[PDB]
Scaffold this active site. Structure first.
Site, PDB file in Angstrom:
ATOM      1  N   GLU A   1     -14.526  34.031  34.176  1.00 13.88           N
ATOM      2  CA  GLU A   1     -15.941  34.159  34.526  1.00 13.88           C
ATOM      3  C   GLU A   1     -16.142  34.390  36.024  1.00 13.88           C
ATOM      4  O   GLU A   1     -16.961  35.224  36.425  1.00 13.88           O
ATOM      5  CB  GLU A   1     -16.709  32.905  34.095  1.00 13.88           C
ATOM      6  CG  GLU A   1     -16.819  32.732  32.596  1.00 13.88           C
ATOM      7  CD  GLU A   1     -17.661  33.810  31.924  1.00 13.88           C
ATOM      8  OE1 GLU A   1     -18.256  34.660  32.622  1.00 13.88           O
ATOM      9  OE2 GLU A   1     -17.728  33.808  30.668  1.00 13.88           O
TER      10      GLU A   1
ATOM     11  N   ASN B   1     -27.377  40.676  35.010  1.00  9.89           N
ATOM     12  CA  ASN B   1     -27.278  41.294  33.706  1.00  9.89           C
ATOM     13  C   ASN B   1     -28.312  42.406  33.556  1.00  9.89           C
ATOM     14  O   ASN B   1     -29.313  42.463  34.275  1.00  9.89           O
ATOM     15  CB  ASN B   1     -27.441  40.230  32.631  1.00  9.89           C
ATOM     16  CG  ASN B   1     -26.433  39.122  32.805  1.00  9.89           C
ATOM     17  OD1 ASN B   1     -25.246  39.391  32.870  1.00  9.89           O
ATOM     18  ND2 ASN B   1     -26.893  37.890  32.903  1.00  9.89           N
TER      19      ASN B   1
ATOM     20  N   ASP C   1     -30.531  42.900  31.438  1.00 10.75           N
ATOM     21  CA  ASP C   1     -31.859  42.426  31.055  1.00 10.75           C
ATOM     22  C   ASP C   1     -32.609  41.748  32.189  1.00 10.75           C
ATOM     23  O   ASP C   1     -33.748  41.312  31.983  1.00 10.75           O
ATOM     24  CB  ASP C   1     -31.761  41.486  29.847  1.00 10.75           C
ATOM     25  CG  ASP C   1     -31.074  40.146  30.172  1.00 10.75           C
ATOM     26  OD1 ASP C   1     -30.622  39.909  31.319  1.00 10.75           O
ATOM     27  OD2 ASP C   1     -30.972  39.315  29.249  1.00 10.75           O
TER      28      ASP C   1
ATOM     29  N   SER D   1     -31.693  38.889  33.793  1.00 11.99           N
ATOM     30  CA  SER D   1     -31.170  37.556  34.064  1.00 11.99           C
ATOM     31  C   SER D   1     -29.950  37.663  34.968  1.00 11.99           C
ATOM     32  O   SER D   1     -29.440  38.750  35.222  1.00 11.99           O
ATOM     33  CB  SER D   1     -30.784  36.851  32.766  1.00 11.99           C
ATOM     34  OG  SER D   1     -29.688  37.499  32.155  1.00 11.99           O
TER      35      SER D   1
ATOM     36  N   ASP E   1     -26.145  35.467  36.087  1.00  9.91           N
ATOM     37  CA  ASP E   1     -25.156  34.434  35.799  1.00  9.91           C
ATOM     38  C   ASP E   1     -24.703  33.826  37.118  1.00  9.91           C
ATOM     39  O   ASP E   1     -24.463  34.556  38.093  1.00  9.91           O
ATOM     40  CB  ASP E   1     -23.926  35.037  35.126  1.00  9.91           C
ATOM     41  CG  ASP E   1     -24.221  35.647  33.783  1.00  9.91           C
ATOM     42  OD1 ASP E   1     -25.253  35.313  33.169  1.00  9.91           O
ATOM     43  OD2 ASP E   1     -23.377  36.450  33.330  1.00  9.91           O
TER      44      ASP E   1
ATOM     45  N   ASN F   1     -26.126  31.299  32.698  1.00  7.89           N
ATOM     46  CA  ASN F   1     -27.125  32.360  32.691  1.00  7.89           C
ATOM     47  C   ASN F   1     -28.550  31.807  32.817  1.00  7.89           C
ATOM     48  O   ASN F   1     -28.911  30.829  32.160  1.00  7.89           O
ATOM     49  CB  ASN F   1     -27.011  33.146  31.385  1.00  7.89           C
ATOM     50  CG  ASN F   1     -27.943  34.279  31.340  1.00  7.89           C
ATOM     51  OD1 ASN F   1     -28.980  34.203  30.712  1.00  7.89           O
ATOM     52  ND2 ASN F   1     -27.577  35.364  31.994  1.00  7.89           N
TER      53      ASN F   1
ATOM     54  N   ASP G   1     -24.475  23.453  22.215  1.00 12.26           N
ATOM     55  CA  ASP G   1     -25.674  24.105  21.690  1.00 12.26           C
ATOM     56  C   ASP G   1     -25.462  24.721  20.316  1.00 12.26           C
ATOM     57  O   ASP G   1     -26.437  25.165  19.701  1.00 12.26           O
ATOM     58  CB  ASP G   1     -26.181  25.166  22.688  1.00 12.26           C
ATOM     59  CG  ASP G   1     -27.593  25.669  22.373  1.00 12.26           C
ATOM     60  OD1 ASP G   1     -28.529  24.846  22.295  1.00 12.26           O
ATOM     61  OD2 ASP G   1     -27.777  26.898  22.241  1.00 12.26           O
TER      62      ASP G   1
HETATM   63  C1  LIG Z   1     -33.713  31.404  20.328  1.00 17.38           C
HETATM   64  N1  LIG Z   1     -33.145  30.422  21.235  1.00 17.38           N
HETATM   65  C2  LIG Z   1     -31.939  30.610  21.753  1.00 17.38           C
HETATM   66  O1  LIG Z   1     -31.318  31.584  21.481  1.00 17.38           O
HETATM   67  C3  LIG Z   1     -31.406  29.676  22.614  1.00 17.38           C
HETATM   68  C4  LIG Z   1     -32.103  28.580  22.924  1.00 17.38           C
HETATM   69  N2  LIG Z   1     -31.361  27.851  23.769  1.00 17.38           N
HETATM   70  C5  LIG Z   1     -30.206  28.493  23.982  1.00 17.38           C
HETATM   71  N3  LIG Z   1     -30.234  29.622  23.267  1.00 17.38           N
HETATM   72  C6  LIG Z   1     -29.003  30.368  23.455  1.00 17.38           C
HETATM   73  N4  LIG Z   1     -33.332  28.391  22.397  1.00 17.38           N
HETATM   74  C7  LIG Z   1     -34.104  27.207  22.724  1.00 17.38           C
HETATM   75  C8  LIG Z   1     -33.854  29.311  21.551  1.00 17.38           C
HETATM   76  O2  LIG Z   1     -34.934  29.146  21.086  1.00 17.38           O
END
Ligand SMILES: Cn1c(=O)c2c(ncn2C)n(C)c1=O
Ligand SMILES: Cn1c(=O)c2c(ncn2C)n(C)c1=O
Ligand code: NA
Ligand code: NA
Ligand code: NA
Ligand code: NA
Ligand code: NA
Ligand code: NA
Lengths: 129, 129
Positions: A35, A46, A48, A50, A52, A59, A101
């Site tokens: 990275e 990026n 879009d 954003s 990193d 990000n 996550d």
């Molecule tokens: C759609 N989405 C995501 O894709 C997301 C997120 N947090 C991390 N990601 C990657 N949240 C809150 C989310 O709603």
């Protein structure tokens, strides 16, 4: 700051990243290698809009606030600049949230493409840890 | 810099002090606690005109140059100010020479009087090392 390989492994261990979410220290060092090349000050924009930030290229679309990523969130509750510090505490704390996550370390595309399934223990080989 | 207990244990281990000359990490952390209270910037003038510097209170009579200790040596080949840095590398490298000089950690009077023979493992208890 540009860390050495074993120096970063030790700092990651100090901050409780080793075997966090089941990911061994070599996985984290490998991710940081590809990275950021171990540079805390690494940034990359990026397509879009954003950006990193830091040793693990976290990000701004979801994880930190930089004030210039419209519609984004700040789930680590930090300015993205905190991710560029010589002290890796903020990057580690945020990485813990990212890896929790749902998709594990696949959140780091370079980990998936360059570390996943490889001999990641080589990244900590020889280190006094 | 004022280190925390486990933070200093980890830095000492990173620099190869743990079990150096047979002295476990708790011995080194205990010595630093009572020499400097973990403060890298600690200095203390001795009655003879020498000065002790840094986290391990290394003395200018033999080990470092401060320009104001007549007749002294500089066996660690460093300015005494290098022993006050936030990075403990110079203090660790010099301590390795001191502890190898014949009397082990008895060179640190506070180690002899306050750490030797005690439960020094308590100083690293709980630390992720
Ligand atoms: C759609 N989405 C995501 O894709 C997301 C997120 N947090 C991390 N990601 C990657 N949240 C809150 C989310 O709603
Ligand atoms: C007498 N003496 C010492 O006492 C000494 C030393 N180095 C450290 N000490 C403590 N040297 C070189 C020395 O000649
Ligand atoms: Na190091
Ligand atoms: Na956690
Ligand atoms: Na993400
Ligand atoms: Na720490
Ligand atoms: Na040595
Ligand atoms: Na001495």
């Amino acid at each position: 700051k540009v860390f050495g390989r074993c120096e970063l492994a030790a700092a990651m261990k100090r901050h409780g990243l080793d075997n966090y979410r089941g990911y061994s220290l070599g996985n984290w060092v490998c991710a940081a290698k590809f990275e950021s090349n171990f540079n805390t000050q690494a940034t990359n924009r990026n397509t879009d809009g954003s950006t990193d930030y830091g040793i693990l290229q976290i990000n701004s679309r979801w994880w930190c606030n930089d004030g210039r990523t419209p519609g984004s969130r700040n789930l680590c509750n930090i300015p993205c600049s905190a991710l560029l510090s010589s002290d890796i505490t903020a990057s580690v704390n945020c990485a813990k949230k990212i890896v929790s996550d749902g998709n594990g370390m696949n959140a780091w595309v370079a980990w998936r493409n360059r570390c996943k399934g490889t001999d990641v223990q080589a990244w900590i080989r020889g280190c006094r840890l």
